[PDB]
Amino acid sequence: TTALVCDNGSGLVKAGFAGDDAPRAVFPSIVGRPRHQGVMVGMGQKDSYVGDEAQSKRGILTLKYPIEHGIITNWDDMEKIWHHTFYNELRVAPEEHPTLLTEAPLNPKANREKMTQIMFETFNVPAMYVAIQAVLSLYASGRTTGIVLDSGDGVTHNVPIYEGYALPHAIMRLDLAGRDLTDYLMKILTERGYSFVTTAEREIVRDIKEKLCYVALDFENEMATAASSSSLEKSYELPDGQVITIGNERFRCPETLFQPSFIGMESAGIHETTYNSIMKCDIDIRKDLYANNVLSGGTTMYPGIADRMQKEITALAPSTMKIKIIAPPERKYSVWIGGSILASLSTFQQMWISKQEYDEAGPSIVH
Amino acid sequence: TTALVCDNGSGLVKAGFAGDDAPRAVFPSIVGRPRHQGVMVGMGQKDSYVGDEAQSKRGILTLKYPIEHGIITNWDDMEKIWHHTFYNELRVAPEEHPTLLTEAPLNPKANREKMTQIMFETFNVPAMYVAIQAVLSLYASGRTTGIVLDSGDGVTHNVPIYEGYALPHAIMRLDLAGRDLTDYLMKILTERGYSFVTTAEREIVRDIKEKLCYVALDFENEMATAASSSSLEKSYELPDGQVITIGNERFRCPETLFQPSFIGMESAGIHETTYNSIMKCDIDIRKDLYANNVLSGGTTMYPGIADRMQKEITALAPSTMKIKIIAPPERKYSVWIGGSILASLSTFQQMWISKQEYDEAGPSIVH
Amino acid sequence: TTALVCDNGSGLVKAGFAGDDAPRAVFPSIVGRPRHQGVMVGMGQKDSYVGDEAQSKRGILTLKYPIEHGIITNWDDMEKIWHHTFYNELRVAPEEHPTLLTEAPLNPKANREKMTQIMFETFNVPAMYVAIQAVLSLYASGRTTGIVLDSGDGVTHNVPIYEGYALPHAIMRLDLAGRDLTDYLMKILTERGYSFVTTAEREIVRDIKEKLCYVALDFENEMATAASSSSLEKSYELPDGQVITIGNERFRCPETLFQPSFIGMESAGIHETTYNSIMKCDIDIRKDLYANNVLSGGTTMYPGIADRMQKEITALAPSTMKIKIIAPPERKYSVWIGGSILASLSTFQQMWISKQEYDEAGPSIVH
Amino acid sequence: TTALVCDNGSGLVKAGFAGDDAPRAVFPSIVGRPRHQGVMVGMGQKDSYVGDEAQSKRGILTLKYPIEHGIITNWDDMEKIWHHTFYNELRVAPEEHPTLLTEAPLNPKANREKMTQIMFETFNVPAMYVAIQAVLSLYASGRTTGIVLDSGDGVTHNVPIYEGYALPHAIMRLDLAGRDLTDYLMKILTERGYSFVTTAEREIVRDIKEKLCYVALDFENEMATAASSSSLEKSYELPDGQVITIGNERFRCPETLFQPSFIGMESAGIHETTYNSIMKCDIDIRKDLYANNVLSGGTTMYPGIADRMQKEITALAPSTMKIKIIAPPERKYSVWIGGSILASLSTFQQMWISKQEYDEAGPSIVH
Amino acid sequence: TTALVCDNGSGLVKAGFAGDDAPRAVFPSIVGRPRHQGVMVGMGQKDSYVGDEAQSKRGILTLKYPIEHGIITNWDDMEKIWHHTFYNELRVAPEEHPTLLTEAPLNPKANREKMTQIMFETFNVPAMYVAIQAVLSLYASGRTTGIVLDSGDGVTHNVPIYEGYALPHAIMRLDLAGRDLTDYLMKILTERGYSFVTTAEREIVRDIKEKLCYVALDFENEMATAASSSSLEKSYELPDGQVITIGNERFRCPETLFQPSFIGMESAGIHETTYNSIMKCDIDIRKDLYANNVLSGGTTMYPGIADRMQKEITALAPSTMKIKIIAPPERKYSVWIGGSILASLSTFQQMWISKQEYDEAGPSIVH
């Protein structure tokens, strides 16, 4: 009966059976809708495209992320990608499987109660559970202590975790993520003349960001090497055939994580928020959090991130203690693995929220 | 009850029953009128000749195209060739058959409303439909995506079409066609001394254009081979018996499609308008339009057109992507086939505009 | 009431009832007047002889053609032969019969208005019509298309006629005819010593021309055969009893139709005027005129004319097309037949010009 | 060295030195040839007469226009009148003077290349130029913008001209001219009985046309005044002594320019061709062409032409804008003046085609 | 020495001295080039026309905007209109005056560096400055806070501005402007049959748009009044003389600013982009931006725009707060005034970029 693990982040749905190594259905969380009223006969009609099909037809469709910063914005578009996820990639009636869902910490109470009420009533699930992302990534590391920085498409979190337990007062969320970085790469890219206005083109630039962009050890050094453009300008090719050449834009896009002042936000960079999170923790356990800080999420995949983190957190923290940062390959897969182990565990099966139980239990019990 | 498909282009009426392979009545759209008041008794009188009969008696008649650039100029001459088409070639009362009519895109609203009001009130049709030409040619190709270049006698169109839908903002019409090319061949032919002033002679030159003329891969190369006149001068024989010899005029007539500056029009050639049409399309779908661009119409029949298109569109488009041009034999037949399939389809029968419905519906509903 | 058909050409009046096969009264159009004041008692006096009676007494009378080149020269001499035609050969009061009259094309407006005013006022005709000669000959051929060459005694015409209608701008008249040929045969005959000065003798030579003269296929060939006079000299016998012997004069008289330079006229021969008439016609219909050119009139009766026409028109026209010349026996009868059929037709009876109507209608309506 | 300006139109050669006010040698373009082989001793012999001498002896000669509709028909007759023009009226060796020649627009390429090859090789000219007629007439008006209607003996043109430049696609040629009008006046005159068959008589009728004929403001009004023949019948006297009386024929001859259907041509009248020429022009410049339309040529000399043009073009053009027609006295002189100014100009002397240069340059460079 | 203010927008150059009230030279930014190779002598030649002269001769010339969407497309055509602006309207050597230039926000770095390098090197300017358009319009309002919507011919901007400072992350550019609206008015106008294909005619329709078009308070209401065409159809007169009658097209052209889906663009209308711009701003200052939103540019001149903005922004924003829109007459003049005041200010004279300084400073300093 094993179990279903659905990681519902902004940008990507990572779903699959528990106890496995990698999610089997990994497709973007979009509901495309035809922009031009196809005045033809037979076309589709396919009033709504979802996921990969919508991706294939980007030029026709208006792409619409149903989930913004972890918050569910549109509730039937979410339903759409869930139904599509259960019957056209996983091929699985939810009635045979308990379902472990995912969500960001410090998230409105409207996401856990409406989410369970849909899973339970529209789909029929024997039992379900909603888990905080960073704890699952810690299971995937195979560790019980550490401070997780999970930066996905919607949200970046810091969740300090000591020997099991948690520290809710030190959990720090920050809306800086791949979606904010791809928009900033939009208006920074347009100073070269390349205009990407539409949602379909936004996912093209998302592609440029995934391949070319990198986090400088020192951005000023990168700027210096860039002035005489030797290796910093690279040629990327669109699907149309044109040639984009991006130099300093390659690295100054991800610099936004460490200098949110480029987007016009006062929030400290992700190194002062992980540092500030360790500050709020009790003086005893900070040495273990400094040593064990973990990384997860697609927005942790920029080459050079871990090294810049080690330079900057080692500059804010007292130099007498060792700051080891553990950033394993397969991060996106790693987050899923931690959730799967918990479903595997012979001690978590008591914590499922039964569907029959849930209606009596109400929203509050789940939270 | 099957259906009637009437392709009303300038120059040729292609009409016949739906579900068939080729139109059965293919005759020129002309209403000849005696030029010299035959001062004889018994002759005709045949105050009006139409189609093939008018063609046979060109020397007596003033030939008058009722439709200029897709726009209906004279409305009872149009009625004349319709009545003639229904009772003397198709032999068919329009009351038994729904009628699919044709028209060019981006055409004045006076053609669809006056056309349906005639079909409905003068003839009596149970139901009818007016369809955009390029979409029918795409059905005839047996394809759902591509950019159609339909060059007939009145008008040349570019209609980009992606996966069903359409892109109205990228539809580009251009008044360059067999009628404009036959007039340019008129005044270019007269530099050899052959004077064709009359409308009857215009259709002779239309005949010369159909047989001899060809589109150079490189016109300058053709000019060079022409200076020493080896194969470029060919002998054509009129119906009178005289011998015309045309050299570079054979190829420089159709060069007007790619260099409209020979007629004194600023519009770009048909390769910059198909290129410009693909430009206005969203960056995602342009690779499919480059690969799938389709051709239709009598003015696509000049030998050498497809190859010149591939040289010129491959010179404007980024050389990294494949520009395949599909130009099947039987183009003139092909346009008709796409319309017939739609009548055949078990999903288009809902879209007919009932005659009774039309009067209540008004002009606007049809459009 | 059937109808009266009067063909009033120079030289011969061909009159009779409509619907018949041949004119019944065929007599020359002359008004003889005694030259020597017969100083006898009882003789005649017959102050005026007309037609056959005048012919019988040629030696006494001055013969006077009332109609020269189609133009009516003397109007009471014309009246004389009309009155004689109606009461002494046709025996018929014109009041019972509508009368179809004849005239050459491109003829002064004084002949149609004075002619109708006489028919109407001096004779009393219920209704009448004046028709162009060549169209009547075309009816007699039983055909609707062709180019008629009608050469009578006064005038030679070319009237191109396509499918009914006419081509007035291509009608070409030329004053070369039996009267001009008989005068040229006069002064060419006098080089043998035979002097014919008088009008009575002119009609003798007209007789010699009708029997002996012939149109050479090649006149130079005829001249060569003539130098050694074997078959080219023939013996003709006058009414007096003397013997005339004419050799090359037999054929060089009708050569004037093809070489008007023998009479001192610049006009091209009748083969360049039929060729030039087909030139002025629209390029489409010329192949039918080349194939269908018709012949009529007494001056088409010279043996050898049709063959010489075919050699000469085939030498001026492009050799790629077939020039058939149709010259049926019974030409003189043939012209009459075409007019009779029109009177017979159940559609021409509307076109009669009523005598009562004519006075109100005036000269202009008739034309 | 000043220059030679030779205006070689059909019917008249207007030649003289540049910078002058009027051409000095103005004589008809004819090569007379004796029709009757003068069997006398001493006469001439003058195997060929040319120009004025041929005119004096019209009764002996066959007159032969060497140039028909602008096209050179016979090339040594043309040479004849050129040689005669250079040595017996201008008295001038062409080797001292560059020669500006004239020709109609849209004229076969055989006239510019054979014309220059003769000027260059038979005569010896240092340099020469061939100019389009209507542009020279525009120089004579002293203006840079306007639409020229030049109607000479062979051809009528419309050449729209805006601010300098030209509009080749709007140039409209039409074979209606004094030669076509004098032939139509031939067969219309013959309905009064006056038969003019010969070429010598054609130039008599050309004289009648020049003096008496006039263009009605309204031809129907002229017809009404003519029915009661008060001022419309005028007496003209031939050189023989006979008296011709022509009424409505006076005005209905030039009506052919506005109703080409009298000659059997489909071409629109000269007011619909000047109107149609302004149509083909870009919407911006049409108001200047309507206001500035110019007139030139001998066939513009009929009294009443300008007023009829203003009534008819003002009836076809939107009545909201002013149609001024400028038709200055001295038209025939005016065309010559525009060419002379260009030779005078200190900027056209670069555009001469050197004789030495021409042989290397070939026919194509001149065109 | 006062100063030069050159507002280089697409469509219009507004230039003049600082401290004045209105720009003195206001002429369109076009470089006309003769389309038909004027085969005349003396004409121009004027190989290039610029501004008003090019406008006068639209029918001859190909008009070519050198600046598209704020981006400089052709750099010597730009140079052309600058040189023309400095010596033939302002009459002023740039060496005596520092020059304040204009540009749109979020514009490629190729426009500020190439623009200064030309101003500095081709012209010689002591010092110069390039300023963001919307800030100058705010100076012209005489205010320090507000959100500027500047819609010109190339680009529409929203620039929120609080108490001096700026908010770069909230600046929102959108390529919808008079050029896009005049093209849409092109293909919408052609459904009435009026075909405007050429660039010269595009500026005619630009004229029609400027006078007749208006922004409906409710477009559906306008459509209803239009069905019974009482006041919605107005008669406009071209320069040719023809009469255009435009009904619903008058208002549905500018509806494109609020419904970009008519051109096939996904971008929200200008009321959702000004609303979305205020969203991105910090919660504190939004009440002042709602109250103070300013308007500038030629595309803000459609009658009815401000009222429609107030209905639509008041429908998106919480109804508890006052949305005052300030749209003063003289907008086009207003933008210039704000720039002139800054030149006038005794505190901006330090911010000039010296020409000598600029070469050392490089492109980056200017930006």
Ligand SMILES: Nc1ncnc2c1ncn2[C@@H]1O[C@H](COP(=O)(O)OP(=O)(O)O)[C@@H](O)[C@H]1O
């Ligand atoms: N290789 C990469 N390099 C940089 N950024 C990436 C890469 N892959 C994905 N991203 C960014 O990270 C996001 C995916 O992260 P993910 O962990 O799937 O987020 P979530 O789990 O919230 O859906 C994408 O939106 C993309 O912008």
Ligand SMILES: Nc1ncnc2c1ncn2[C@@H]1O[C@H](COP(=O)(O)OP(=O)(O)O)[C@@H](O)[C@H]1O
């Ligand atoms: N074999 C040919 N080669 C070149 N041109 C042709 C040929 N056949 C027809 N045309 C031109 O194309 C026109 C016919 O095209 P068609 O597709 O029938 O136009 P429509 O559908 O608008 O009537 C004719 O007017 C002729 O000028």
Ligand SMILES: Nc1ncnc2c1ncn2[C@@H]1O[C@H](COP(=O)(O)OP(=O)(O)O)[C@@H](O)[C@H]1O
């Ligand atoms: N058998 C003949 N051979 C040659 N010429 C003839 C013959 N018969 C008649 N002609 C000539 O033709 C004339 C008669 O032709 P006809 O058709 O009667 O002319 P019309 O109809 O004008 O009177 C006579 O004047 C005579 O000169």
Ligand SMILES: Nc1ncnc2c1ncn2[C@@H]1O[C@H](COP(=O)(O)OP(=O)(O)O)[C@@H](O)[C@H]1O
């Ligand atoms: N006064 C006149 N009135 C009417 N027609 C005239 C007059 N003078 C000349 N023409 C006609 O115009 C012709 C002369 O025109 P012209 O301008 O010399 O032609 P081109 O320049 O082609 O030789 C003559 O053939 C004559 O028929």
Ligand SMILES: Nc1ncnc2c1ncn2[C@@H]1O[C@H](COP(=O)(O)OP(=O)(O)O)[C@@H](O)[C@H]1O
């Ligand atoms: N009265 C008007 N009504 C509507 N639109 C106008 C009017 N005047 C100008 N426009 C449009 O605005 C444009 C001029 O705006 P402008 O502020 O000069 O733009 P820019 O400053 O970018 O040159 C023109 O291209 C025209 O299309």
Ligand SMILES: [Mg+2]
């Ligand atoms: Mg995540």
Ligand SMILES: [Mg+2]
């Ligand atoms: Mg077609």
Ligand SMILES: [Mg+2]
């Ligand atoms: Mg006869």
Ligand SMILES: [Mg+2]
């Ligand atoms: Mg002339």
Ligand SMILES: [Mg+2]
């Ligand atoms: Mg502006």
